[PDB]
Design a protein around this ligand. Structure first.
Ligand SMILES: CCCCCCCCCCCCCCCCCC(=O)OC[C@H](COP(=O)([O-])OCC(O)COP(=O)([O-])OC[C@@H](COC(=O)CCCCCCCCCCCCCCCCC)OC(=O)CCCCCCCCCCCCCCCCC)OC(=O)CCCCCCCCCCCCCCCCC
Ligand SMILES: CCCCCCCCCCCCCCCCCC(=O)OC[C@H](COP(=O)([O-])OCC(O)COP(=O)([O-])OC[C@@H](COC(=O)CCCCCCCCCCCCCCCCC)OC(=O)CCCCCCCCCCCCCCCCC)OC(=O)CCCCCCCCCCCCCCCCC
Ligand SMILES: CCCCCCCCCCCCCCCCCC(=O)OC[C@H](COP(=O)([O-])OCC(O)COP(=O)([O-])OC[C@@H](COC(=O)CCCCCCCCCCCCCCCCC)OC(=O)CCCCCCCCCCCCCCCCC)OC(=O)CCCCCCCCCCCCCCCCC
Ligand SMILES: CC(C)=CCC/C(C)=C\CC/C(C)=C/CC/C(C)=C/CC/C(C)=C/CC/C(C)=C/CC/C(C)=C/CC/C(C)=C/CC/C(C)=C\CC1=C(C)C(=O)c2ccccc2C1=O
Ligand SMILES: CCCCCCCCCCCCCCCC(=O)O[C@H](COC(=O)CCCCCCC[C@@H](C)CCCCCCCCC)COP(=O)(O)O[C@H]1[C@H](O)[C@H](O)[C@H](O)[C@@H](O)[C@@H]1O
Ligand SMILES: CCCCCCCCCCCCCCCC(=O)O[C@H](COC(=O)CCCCCCC[C@@H](C)CCCCCCCCC)COP(=O)(O)O[C@H]1[C@H](O)[C@H](O)[C@H](O)[C@@H](O)[C@@H]1O
Ligand SMILES: CCCCCCCC/C=C\CCCCCCCC(=O)OC[C@H](COP(=O)(O)OCCN)OC(=O)CCCCCCCCCCCCCCC
Ligand code: HEM
Ligand code: HEM
Lengths: 37, 92, 139, 535, 52, 203, 52, 55, 223
């Protein structure tokens, strides 16, 4: 990590900011199946 | 802002063209910066030899000799590792 | 800081309940009445969490919703001047060494090494605290 | 009319003699104002205090082994056979007003003299104040340190005492008499015969009040004259070059601050002579060969020799019908230590190759190998010093005495190497820190960039800044760099009123504006002088 | 259209760059690494006791 | 070095802008004080166990508490807390010298409290009760003397903060430092109120 | 976050851990040894009378 | 302060219960801090003078 | 006395039979036999607390006593009856003598101390180190009976000074010197412990040298 941990910060929406950052298509999916359990 | 930059011309006089370089020791030109590796290797070997030789003495104890053996062994191991790595070009 | 305060409020509720029930069930149904050690410890950990939660609640009511607390908060919203975070400093190791010299003086009952460790600790804490306030040397 | 008297006396002085030019030269001589350059002054002032207290002590001390029963005032030692030296030391302690204080401040001054000589030696060695010029100054300073060591050795041995007499019996007798070819001959010629010879203390008294202090005074005169006429070297800085001395003139500032420092040093010595007990000879009974204590240590300056004696592993050689005791080992060790200390500048110049006339010091970080070697030597010295104290270390800090002895034995070859490596790497990393500060500016508080969540420390460049944010890196100039905006013009103007109450705003503004103007003037003067010299 | 990288990342680093950081370390990341190494050293020390 | 890369008039500033955000220094101080509360909880547990195991006469016959000297000292500590809060108000304002005055009188009254506690210690030791002398003596001395050590630490913090204010210009950083030192002093006086009510009144 | 709240404090925490840990291990070098009483260090066994 | 401490040194040296006191004797406490008082007064006087000069 | 013997036996049976086996015979490799040690040995050792010993190490350290004076006397009487040996001194009333053991002569006591005691303890009774983890402890805690009984029975790695070797008058003088040196105030300031060179050098280097260096840093200018 760069000193001070970051040169950027993604849109923080859920408990997986990096997963949303790296896989934008999943963003809708992570919400659709969330409640199904 | 309340600081003035410094201009320094120290008299120089080995010319540092061989030995250590600024990339390794930034102030190589400003003072003695290189100790030949042979000096340190031989110093470590002689320190280990002295530790081993101190086993011969007027002490009925044995943990003393074992401590000497351990310290001499680690010194020799460090010297051997350094020498081997430098022989191979700092590999492994 | 609503959630930060509410966490400690929940802890306070639970610890107060634990202290009360322990005190009651130890005053009665125990061999020698109130235990007086567990009871006090539970009461004052309730106090710990109560102090922290009360301060957090005061701050939550004093401060408007921060970006951190606000869902749907953009990074630009919080972007700005973060405060002073201390850069490199070698005073912490000196403080630790001074406190260790006081601790060994306490262990090995050496009043002279306690006295010096404490002096050492005062000096190093002064250095740490004054590190970023010692004005330029005035000659 | 004090002004008239002063003018008349000046005219009389300049008529009888003609010291105007020389006195002006002395007054105008410039001395660098670095704190580390007062370390030698500490030793000089402690020496002066030593002389002043030693005269008082000689007025009351009687050196002799002539046996006497005390019959004095100290009850716990009454009717006990003792030497006249011990009896008169007890008389100084008890039956002379302020004698205990005078002898205590004398011994404390001796300890400070040794300690300040050691610190001054560290300063000069680590800053390279010995190369090309001043190498002879270093040599005579090493002789001075050795003389001070043995002077204190004879001093605390002067009052014939159980502790100090045991120390004498160990070192002066055993080591001297163990030396192979002439050991016994040196012993008998020093002691006028066997160890308790009736002339030892008178001889040491002569050596300690006149002979060795006379040589120390002569060598201090040579040292100070050399420093005076071989202008004091200085650290690299804004206007400081190899052909100038930047500092303050002797008369107005340097003289007053040196006198004040002398006053404060003698105050510290007097405070310690009062508040701290040193060498309670009354507790330490009179010397008797059959009696001894468990401590049996010399002063901290000879503690390293004693520790060498303790640690060296009992190696004795027996040639044809002869013995070579372990004392010769420590004697040769001391000889090597002193030879290396005296000959270091020449050893360093032979090794490196630098015979250039050096007037600008070099920061210890800038010379990793020499600072590493000095750290290694200081580590060895500390190891030996604590080995000499292993008895009390073992007693108080619960560690077996054999364990302490063998810790010293192993460390004296392990600890020097560890400290050498650590000091070398530490110096190089200090250089790396200086370079990072040069190329990135000083560090400050963190800021979160506007568009994105980048975190940047928001440095502050120390030089011209490129068209964009990043600055033009500066080149290292051998001088310390400010690593805290604390120490620059940042948050340094508290209300100048007082501790309890403010001052009028007009006065505060006048004061702060005048101070800022003075800082600007000083910095501009340094900058312009630097430009003129290098352009 | 191509990047000039090193054949391999820097293995260790220049002499004397860590020793002073450790003393003056104020980066949590380095401190966390110091914790892990030092804590693990005590695991080996404490673990050696279990073998005895 | 044109003007500065960091557009700040203080090399050290508030660790976060406290107007909109919590003060990190205050939060950390409050948490640490809540921990010191548990330290004193351990001490209280020791004292209460000794009290419970006492055979009816909790303060043994040799020991006798001196309310005449214990009421003035606690009153002085309460006064010190009030003056410390006044100094906090000064620090919230830009009143450097008002803060200094209030904290100086607070330090003086805290030193008076420490000296009064020492006097009561000397009197108690003279009249029998001692740490090794009795369980009551030992628990009482541990509790009250650890509190006295905390008061000494608060005095050291006061003088140290005053030196800091002397050496650097007053800023929100120093104001927050004064605020947290006052938090420590208030915690100390609160635990003293608890200890007084326990040792003397409740017994 | 870029760093911890008090990054000089967490540096002190590590060094307090390291040096605090070492002086506990230091019981071994003493002739008596380290602490006899178990990790729990129960009261009567720990007082000066027992395990002195 | 330097001058007052110098006068204190003078007065203490001239008038203080110096002289050895055997043991557990009335005046032993005064004797024990006799020399410390000499040193305290002298050192404080000259140290204060030096501090004044430095200031 | 019958009840004193019974009390000593009861204390012995629940204190030390695990390492000084019942019948006072010593447990091989755990503790020596107490036959012949006498009442003085028991008094000194138990009163100093060394004997409720919870480790076998280089030396048994001192500690708070586990028995009060009456129980100390009971144990001593039991051991004396079983083995028979030296007895602790007592005054006219019957209590263990404390002031009666202060010999009149202190110069003689100091000379004897230096010849015999200072050998390992100190010039003035501070502690001293010994071969392998052992050490001579500071004598400032010991009371006159404890010092006298320590001489009378060499506790551990300490020579046993019989009455013939050191007549009770000589032991009383040594006790007087020990107490006097321990209770005597340091003339000339704070005696840094009792060891001259080492505490004096540390105090120099820490108090005087830091003061000098700090004053030099104040006066001079960093550069
Ligand atoms: C003892 C220990 C205590 C401390 C004492 C040591 C102090 C040393 C500091 C030196 C200061 C010094 O000498 O300044 C004097 C200095 C002399 O030198 P200068 O004037 O610069 O002359 C040109 C240079 O010397 C020309 O020199 P240069 O700059 O070209 O370099 C050449 C240099 C080469 O450098 C060296 O080698 C110098 C080092 C000398 C080596 C050892 C000699 C010193 C041995 C001292 C032993 C003491 C015991 O050689 C010397 O100058 C050697 C001079 C030796 C004098 C040493 C004094 C001690 O000027 C004065 O004389 C000023 C004082 C005036 C006095 C008169 C006042 C009024 C008269 C009243 C009388 C009665 C009144 C009643 C009515
Ligand atoms: C029991 C052990 C006692 C532990 C007491 C220390 C723990 C406190 C930690 C939490 C407090 C909040 C905090 O983060 O501390 C800031 C600061 C950490 O600085 P940082 O991480 O770089 O961040 C910048 C600060 O946040 C920026 O804030 P700051 O630097 O301005 O901090 C303000 C106050 C921060 O607020 C406080 O910490 C209140 C001070 C109460 C402690 C009083 C000691 C009570 C224990 C005595 C009985 C044992 O700073 C002061 O000006 C007063 C400090 C006075 C400390 C006196 C300690 C001397 C102990 C020896 C006493 C001798 C008597 C016994 C014999 O911690 C300290 O200054 C305390 C030094 C640690 C001392 C350990 C002693 C071993
Ligand atoms: C007994 C006497 C009282 C004991 C307390 C004295 C300490 C207070 C003054 C320390 C601050 C200081 O000197 O700077 C302010 C100022 C120096 O101004 P400057 O040198 O022109 O500029 C400094 C720059 O800001 C340069 O700033 P910097 O950040 O580079 O460092 C500034 C300064 C201080 O920076 C620090 O490292 C702060 C920590 C040291 C403060 C210690 C306070 C607590 C001491 C308790 C016990 C001490 C042992 O550096 C020092 O350590 C100076 C030496 C003082 C060491 C104190 C003893 C260790 O000095 C004064 O206000 C008066 C100082 C008078 C000289 C006495 C110093 C040595 C005597 C103490 C040792 C005695 C041992 C026996 C017990
Ligand atoms: C019971 C009892 C007997 C008690 C007493 C104890 C006892 C026996 C003795 C101590 C008693 C005394 C007399 C103590 C005080 C000692 C003393 C003379 C202190 C002077 C300090 C003082 C009072 C200062 C007052 C403040 C003030 C206005 C100062 C400015 C004016 C003064 C005094 C200037 C003095 C300048 C000074 C130190 C000159 C020293 C002369 C010498 C030997 C060398 C000069 C010199 C120096 C100082 C260098 O640093 C130097 C550096 C590099 C190259 C060369 C030199 C060099 O030649
Ligand atoms: C300046 C100090 C730094 C030194 C740096 C050098 C580091 C290397 C240290 C070398 C350690 C050597 C240890 C061995 C030594 C040895 O051989 O001795 C033994 C005792 O073993 C031990 O404990 C070993 C303990 C080793 C711990 C070393 C700790 C290092 C510390 C000192 C580092 C902190 C330094 C602080 C710096 C302060 C800075 C100041 C500015 C046995 O004695 P003994 O006791 O007679 O044992 C008998 C049985 O044998 C027999 O069976 C049985 O029958 C019994 O008789 C039994 O007694
Ligand atoms: C800065 C300048 C100021 C210098 C300090 C000056 C202090 C002046 C003190 C007041 C005047 C002199 C008092 C002399 C009365 C007196 O002597 O003071 C003893 C105390 O002694 C102790 O314990 C020590 C108590 C702790 C406080 C003193 C500690 C100061 C040290 C730290 C100064 C040196 C620096 C070293 C730095 C260390 C760190 C190195 C990295 C007290 O009696 P006591 O305690 O019972 O002594 C036992 C006999 O009884 C008993 O028999 C005998 O057997 C013994 O056990 C004896 O101790
Ligand atoms: C990682 C290693 C892990 C090693 C861990 C082992 C720990 C166990 C040690 C002691 C346990 C308590 C026993 C205590 C008694 C000793 C046992 C015994 O009796 O063993 C027979 C002879 C002496 O015979 P002695 O009758 O004692 O008499 C003699 C004179 N009279 O020693 C021998 O040959 C055998 C050697 C015995 C111990 C030597 C251990 C010392 C140090 C080892 C290496 C240090 C390395 C340092 C590295 C920098
Ligand atoms: C009685 C012992 C000593 C006295 C009185 C003394 C005094 C002084 C003084 C006052 C200075 C000038 C101020 C300073 O550089 O700090 C100085 C410089 C010097 N000393 Fe000494 N010192 C002593 C011991 C030593 C030792 C042991 C060495 C080795 C040594 C070598 C040097 C050198 C090479 C210089 C020149 C430093 C320079 O020109 O900047 N001195 N001495
Ligand atoms: C040059 C550096 C000197 C050093 C390092 C030194 C060191 C010492 C020391 C440590 C003592 C022991 C004091 C004690 O145990 O109470 C002592 C005693 C003594 N010194 Fe020096 N001294 C020096 C110079 C002088 C001078 C110049 C004189 C005479 C003018 C002198 C005269 C005496 C006398 C007479 C004693 C005996 C005092 C006693 O037995 O208590 N000394 N010295």
């Amino acid at each position: 990590p760069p000193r001070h941990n970051f040169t950027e910060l993604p849109r923080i929406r859920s408990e997986r900011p990096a997963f949303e950052l790296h896989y934008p298509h999943m963003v809708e999916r992570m919400r659709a199946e969330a409640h199904v359990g | 802002m309340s600081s003035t930059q410094d201009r320094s011309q120290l008299d120089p006089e080995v010319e540092r063209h061989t030995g250590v370089d600024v990339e390794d020791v930034p102030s190589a030109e400003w003072g003695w910066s290189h100790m030949p590796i042979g000096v340190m290797h031989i110093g470590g070997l002689l320190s280990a030899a002295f530790l081993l030789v101190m086993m011969r003495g007027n002490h009925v104890g044995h943990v003393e000799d074992w401590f000497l053996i351990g310290f001499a062994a680690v010194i020799v191991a460090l010297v051997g590792r350094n020498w081997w790595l430098r022989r191979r070009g700092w590999i492994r | 800081m609503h959630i930060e305060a509410r966490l400690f409020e929940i802890l306070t509720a639970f610890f107060a309940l634990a202290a009360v029930v322990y005190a009651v069930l130890t005053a009665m149904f125990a061999t020698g009445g109130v235990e007086w050690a567990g009871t006090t410890a539970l009461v004052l950990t309730t106090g710990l969490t109560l102090i922290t939660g009360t301060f957090f609640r005061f701050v939550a009511r004093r401060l408007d919703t921060r970006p951190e607390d606000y869902e749907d908060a953009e990074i630009s919203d919080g972007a700005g001047e973060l405060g002073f975070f201390a850069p490199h400093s070698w005073w912490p190791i000196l403080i630790s060494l001074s406190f260790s010299t006081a601790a060994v003086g306490a262990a090995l009952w050496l009043p002279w090494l306690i006295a010096a460790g404490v002096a050492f600790v005062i000096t190093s804490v002064c250095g740490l605290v004054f590190e970023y306030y010692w004005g330029p040397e005035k000659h | 009319d004090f002004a008239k008297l002063a003018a008349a006396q000046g005219d009389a002085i300049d008529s009888r003699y003609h010291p105007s030019a020389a006195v002006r030269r002395q007054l105008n001589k410039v001395f660098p104002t670095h704190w580390s350059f007062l370390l030698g002054e500490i030793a000089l002032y402690s020496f002066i205090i030593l002389l002043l207290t030693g005269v008082w002590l000689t007025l009351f001390f009687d050196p002799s082994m002539a046996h006497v029963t005390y019959d004095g005032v100290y009850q716990p030692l009454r009717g006990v056979q003792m030497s006249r030296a011990y009896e008169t030391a007890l008389d100084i302690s008890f039956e002379v007003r302020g004698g205990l204080f005078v002898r205590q401040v004398h011994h404390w001054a001796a300890l400070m003299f040794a300690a300040s000589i050691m610190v001054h030696l560290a300063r000069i060695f680590f800053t390279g104040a010995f190369r090309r010029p001043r190498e002879a100054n270093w040599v005579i300073g090493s002789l001075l340190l050795i003389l001070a060591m043995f002077e204190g050795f004879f001093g605390y041995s002067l009052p014939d005492d159980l502790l100090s007499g045991t120390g004498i019996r160990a070192a002066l007798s055993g080591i001297t008499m163990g030396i192979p070819v002439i050991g016994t001959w040196m012993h008998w010629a020093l002691f006028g015969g066997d160890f308790p010879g009736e002339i030892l203390i008178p001889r040491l008294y002569a050596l300690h009040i006149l002979l060795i202090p006379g040589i120390i005074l002569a060598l201090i005169g040579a040292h100070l004259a050399l420093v005076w006429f071989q202008k004091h070297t200085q650290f690299p800085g804004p206007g400081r070059t190899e052909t100038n001395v930047v500092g303050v003139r002797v008369m107005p500032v340097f003289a007053v601050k040196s006198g004040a420092f002398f006053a404060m040093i003698t105050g510290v010595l007097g405070l310690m002579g009062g508040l701290l007990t040193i060498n309670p000879i009354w507790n330490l009974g009179p010397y008797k060969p059959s009696q001894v204590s468990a401590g049996s240590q010399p002063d901290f300056y000879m503690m390293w020799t004693d520790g060498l004696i303790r640690l060296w592993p009992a190696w004795e050689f027996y040639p044809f019908g002869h013995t070579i005791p372990q004392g010769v080992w420590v004697a040769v060790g001391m000889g090597l230590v002193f030879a290396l200390l005296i000959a270091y500048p020449f050893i360093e110049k032979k090794v490196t190759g630098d015979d250039a006339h050096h007037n600008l010091l070099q920061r210890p970080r800038d010379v990793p190998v020499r600072t590493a070697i000095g750290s290694m030597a200081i580590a060895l010295y500390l190891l030996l010093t604590f080995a000499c104290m292993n008895d009390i270390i073992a007693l108080k800090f619960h560690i077996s005495l054999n364990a302490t002895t063998w810790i010293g034995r192993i460390g004296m070859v392990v600890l020097p190497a560890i400290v050498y490596f650590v000091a070398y790497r530490w110096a190089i990393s200090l250089q790396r820190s200086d370079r990072e500060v040069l190329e990135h500016g000083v560090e400050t508080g963190i800021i979160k960039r506007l568009p994105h969540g980048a975190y940047v420390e928001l440095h502050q460049p120390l030089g011209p800044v490129d068209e964009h944010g990043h600055p033009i890196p500066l080149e290292y100039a051998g001088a310390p760099l400010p690593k805290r905006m604390n120490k620059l013009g940042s948050g340094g103007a508290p209300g100048t009123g007082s501790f309890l109450f403010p001052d009028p705003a007009v006065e505060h503004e006048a004061l702060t504006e005048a101070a800022h103007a003075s800082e600007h003037k000083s910095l501009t003067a340094l900058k312009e002088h630097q430009d003129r010299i290098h352009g | 259209e191509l990047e000039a990288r090193r054949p391999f990342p820097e293995r260790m680093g220049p002499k004397g760059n860590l020793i002073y950081k450790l003393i003056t370390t104020t980066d949590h990341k380095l401190i966390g690494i110091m914790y892990c190494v030092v804590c693990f050293a005590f695991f080996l020390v404490g673990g050696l006791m279990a073998l005895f | 070095m044109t003007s500065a890369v960091g557009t700040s008039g203080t090399a050290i500033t508030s660790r976060v802008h406290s107007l909109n955000r919590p003060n990190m220094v205050s939060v950390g101080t409050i948490v640490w004080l809540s921990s010191e509360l548990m330290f004193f909880a351990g001490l209280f547990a020791m004292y209460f166990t000794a009290r419970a195991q006492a055979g009816g006469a909790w303060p043994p016959e040799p020991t006798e508490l001196n309310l005449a000297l214990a009421v003035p000292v606690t009153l002085v500590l309460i006064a010190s807390s009030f003056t410390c809060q006044m100094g906090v108000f000064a620090a919230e304002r830009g009143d450097v010298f008002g803060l200094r005055r209030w904290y100086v009188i607070t330090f003086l009254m805290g030193l008076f409290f420490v000296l009064g506690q020492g006097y009561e210690y000397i009197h108690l030791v003279e009249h029998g009760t001692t740490i090794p002398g009795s369980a009551y003596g030992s628990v009482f001395y541990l509790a009250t003397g650890f509190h006295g050590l905390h008061v000494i630490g608060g005095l050291v913090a006061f003088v140290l903060l005053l030196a800091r204010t002397k050496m650097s210009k007053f800023t929100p950083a120093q104001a927050t430092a004064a605020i947290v030192v006052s938090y420590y002093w208030h915690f100390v006086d609160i635990v003293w109120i608890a200890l007084f009510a326990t040792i003397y009144f409740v017994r | 976050a870029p760093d911890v709240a008090f990054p000089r404090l967490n540096a002190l925490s590590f060094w307090l851990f390291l040096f605090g840990a070492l002086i506990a291990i230091a019981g071994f070098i003493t002739p008596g040894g380290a602490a006899d009483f178990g990790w729990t260090a129960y009261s009567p066994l720990t007082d000066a009378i027992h395990s002195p | 302060l330097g001058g007052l401490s110098g006068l204190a040194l003078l007065l203490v040296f001239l008038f203080w219960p110096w002289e050895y006191q055997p043991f557990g004797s009335e005046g032993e406490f005064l004797y024990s801090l006799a020399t410390p008082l000499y040193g305290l007064t002298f050192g404080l006087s000259i140290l204060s003078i030096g501090i004044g000069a430095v200031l | 006395q019958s009840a004193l013997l019974r009390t000593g036996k009861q204390l012995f049976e629940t204190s030390c039979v695990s390492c000084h086996g019942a019948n006072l015979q010593g447990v091989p490799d755990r503790g020596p036999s107490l036959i012949g040690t006498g009442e003085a040995a028991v008094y000194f050792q138990v009163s100093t607390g060394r004997m409720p010993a919870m480790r076998g190490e280089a030396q048994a350290p001192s500690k708070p006593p586990h028995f009060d004076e009456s129980q100390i006397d009971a144990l001593g009487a039991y051991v004396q009856a079983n083995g028979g040996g030296p007895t602790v001194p007592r005054d006219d009333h019957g209590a263990v003598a404390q002031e009666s053991l202060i010999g009149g002569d202190v110069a003689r006591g100091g000379d004897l101390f230096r010849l015999n005691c200072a050998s390992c303890h100190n010039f003035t009774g501070k502690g001293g180190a010994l071969s392998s983890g052992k050490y001579a402890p500071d004598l400032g805690d010991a009371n006159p009976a404890q010092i006298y009984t320590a001489m009378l029975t060499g506790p551990q790695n300490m020579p046993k000074f019989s009455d013939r070797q050191l007549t009770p008058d000589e032991k009383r003088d040594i006790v007087a010197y020990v107490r006097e040196s321990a209770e005597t105030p340091s003339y000339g300031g704070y005696g840094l412990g009792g060891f001259g060179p080492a505490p004096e050098g540390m105090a120099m280097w820490i108090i005087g040298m830091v003061a000098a260096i700090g004053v030099a840093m104040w006066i001079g200018s960093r550069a």
